[PDB]
Design an enzyme around this catalytic site. Structure first.
Site, PDB file in Angstrom:
ATOM      1  N   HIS A  44      -0.692  57.183  -2.721  1.00  0.00           N
ATOM      2  CA  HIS A  44      -1.497  58.765  -3.598  1.00  0.00           C
ATOM      3  C   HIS A  44      -1.592  58.379  -4.703  1.00  0.00           C
ATOM      4  O   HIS A  44      -2.754  59.491  -4.561  1.00  0.00           O
ATOM      5  CB  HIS A  44      -1.166  59.541  -2.159  1.00  0.00           C
ATOM      6  N   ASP A  88       4.531  55.200   0.627  1.00  0.00           N
ATOM      7  CA  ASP A  88       3.823  55.650  -0.520  1.00  0.00           C
ATOM      8  C   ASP A  88       4.462  54.783  -1.882  1.00  0.00           C
ATOM      9  O   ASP A  88       5.384  55.893  -2.896  1.00  0.00           O
ATOM     10  CB  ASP A  88       3.777  57.429  -0.701  1.00  0.00           C
ATOM     11  N   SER A 181       4.126  64.017  -8.067  1.00  0.00           N
ATOM     12  CA  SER A 181       4.063  63.166  -7.789  1.00  0.00           C
ATOM     13  C   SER A 181       4.086  61.986  -8.177  1.00  0.00           C
ATOM     14  O   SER A 181       3.736  61.764  -9.663  1.00  0.00           O
ATOM     15  CB  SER A 181       2.940  62.850  -6.881  1.00  0.00           C
TER      16      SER A 181
HETATM   17  C1  LIG Z   1      -5.476  60.499  -6.296  1.00  0.00           C
HETATM   18  O1  LIG Z   1      -4.163  61.756  -6.347  1.00  0.00           O
HETATM   19  C2  LIG Z   1      -3.956  63.090  -5.778  1.00  0.00           C
HETATM   20  O2  LIG Z   1      -4.636  63.367  -4.963  1.00  0.00           O
HETATM   21  N1  LIG Z   1      -2.927  63.869  -6.444  1.00  0.00           N
HETATM   22  C3  LIG Z   1      -1.738  63.353  -7.142  1.00  0.00           C
HETATM   23  C4  LIG Z   1      -2.850  64.667  -5.202  1.00  0.00           C
HETATM   24  C5  LIG Z   1      -1.606  65.346  -4.782  1.00  0.00           C
HETATM   25  C6  LIG Z   1      -0.439  65.136  -4.746  1.00  0.00           C
HETATM   26  C7  LIG Z   1       0.188  66.233  -6.458  1.00  0.00           C
HETATM   27  O3  LIG Z   1      -0.517  67.223  -6.012  1.00  0.00           O
HETATM   28  O4  LIG Z   1       0.955  66.051  -6.488  1.00  0.00           O
HETATM   29  N2  LIG Z   1       0.373  65.362  -3.799  1.00  0.00           N
HETATM   30  C8  LIG Z   1       2.305  65.758  -3.506  1.00  0.00           C
HETATM   31  C9  LIG Z   1       2.389  66.675  -2.917  1.00  0.00           C
HETATM   32  C10 LIG Z   1       0.883  67.804  -1.827  1.00  0.00           C
HETATM   33  C11 LIG Z   1       1.339  69.290  -1.095  1.00  0.00           C
HETATM   34  C12 LIG Z   1       2.657  69.400  -1.682  1.00  0.00           C
HETATM   35  C13 LIG Z   1       3.900  69.059  -2.187  1.00  0.00           C
HETATM   36  C14 LIG Z   1       4.562  69.465  -2.749  1.00  0.00           C
HETATM   37  C15 LIG Z   1       6.333  69.011  -2.998  1.00  0.00           C
HETATM   38  C16 LIG Z   1       5.482  67.702  -3.541  1.00  0.00           C
HETATM   39  F1  LIG Z   1       6.675  67.100  -4.541  1.00  0.00           F
HETATM   40  C17 LIG Z   1       4.356  66.922  -3.286  1.00  0.00           C
HETATM   41  C18 LIG Z   1       3.634  67.496  -3.017  1.00  0.00           C
HETATM   42  C19 LIG Z   1      -0.199  64.226  -3.028  1.00  0.00           C
HETATM   43  C20 LIG Z   1       0.555  64.408  -1.648  1.00  0.00           C
HETATM   44  C21 LIG Z   1      -0.557  63.177  -0.523  1.00  0.00           C
HETATM   45  C22 LIG Z   1      -1.697  62.747  -1.002  1.00  0.00           C
HETATM   46  C23 LIG Z   1      -1.871  63.653  -2.250  1.00  0.00           C
HETATM   47  C24 LIG Z   1      -1.517  64.229  -3.093  1.00  0.00           C
END
Ligand SMILES: COC(=O)N(C)Cc1c(C(=O)O)n(Cc2cccc3ccc(F)cc23)c2ccccc12
Ligand SMILES: [Zn+2]
Length: 224
Positions: A44, A88, A181
């Site tokens: 992701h 993932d 992440s």
């Molecule tokens: C291209 O990159 C992106 O689009 N991203 C990096 C954004 C994105 C994130 C992020 O901001 O880290 N996360 C992790 C996440 C999101 C929400 C609640 C959370 C709670 C605990 C935790 F440990 C992680 C969480 C995702 C998960 C899935 C899709 C997209 C993202």
């Protein structure tokens, strides 16, 4: 990282900071060096352009310890599913090999049938948010305990313990969060997990990818 401390500078030299760009805009993730030419992270975190920084502590300032390498290839797992956030995991082939030193070197992966059982204490590290809206310039870390499968099965409809790990005691304000992440869960100095997702509230338990489940795909990819 919520509820953690500043890392000892350069104490986790496998840590990678990812600056991600795509049509959808700018994002930030963690990751970890698993060989001189490969970083492991979450699928992701994919973008059309990813730059990796190794050797960093304060990623907002220049330090002569840093190595900045663009990813030549961003290889998501072929069955990665955006909707369920399953499978993932993603490998980044670095456009050049790192220069290995005190501040930049890889971390070991688990063995296939070794396992990771509830009650095990681990550490996760990253440059992510420290609360709902506020961030950090410098690497931070926190200790989290492995939870039982049912603790995530109850609250996450798509959870699969074959492929994911349940992490974090809901009783403590301690969690990986947004910005973290892709970063590692270290247990006894081995990277067993990858920060995947959790509740928007930041309250655990939360979901990590279980590395041991993907070792065949990892090995095959890096070999080719
Ligand atoms: C291209 O990159 C992106 O689009 N991203 C990096 C954004 C994105 C994130 C992020 O901001 O880290 N996360 C992790 C996440 C999101 C929400 C609640 C959370 C709670 C605990 C935790 F440990 C992680 C969480 C995702 C998960 C899935 C899709 C997209 C993202
Ligand atoms: Zn330094």
């Amino acid at each position: 990282i919520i509820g953690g401390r500043e890392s000892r500078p350069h104490s986790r030299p496998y840590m990678a900071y990812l600056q991600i760009q795509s049509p959808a805009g700018q994002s930030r993730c963690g990751g970890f060096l698993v060989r001189e030419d490969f970083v492991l992270t979450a699928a992701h975190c994919w973008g059309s352009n990813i730059n990796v920084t190794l050797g960093a502590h304060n990623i907002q300032r220049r330090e002569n310890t840093q190595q900045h390498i663009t990813a030549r290839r961003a290889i998501r797992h072929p069955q990665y599913n955006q909707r369920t956030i399953q499978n993932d995991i993603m490998l980044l082939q670095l456009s050049r090999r790192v220069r290995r030193n005190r501040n930049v070197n890889p971390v070991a992966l688990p063995r296939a049938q070794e396992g990771l059982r509830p009650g095990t204490l681990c550490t996760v590290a990253g440059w992510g948010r420290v609360s709902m809206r506020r961030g950090t310039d410098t690497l931070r870390e926190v200790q989290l305990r492995v939870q039982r499968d049912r603790q995530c099965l109850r609250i996450f409809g798509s959870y699969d313990p074959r492929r994911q790990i349940c992490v974090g005691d809901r009783r403590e304000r301690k969690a990986a969060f947004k910005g973290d992440s892709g970063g590692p869960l270290l247990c006894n100095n081995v990277a067993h997990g990858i920060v995947s997702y959790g509740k928007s509230s930041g309250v655990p338990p939360e979901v990590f990818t279980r590395v041991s489940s993907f070792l065949p795909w990892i090995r095959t990819t890096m070999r080719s």
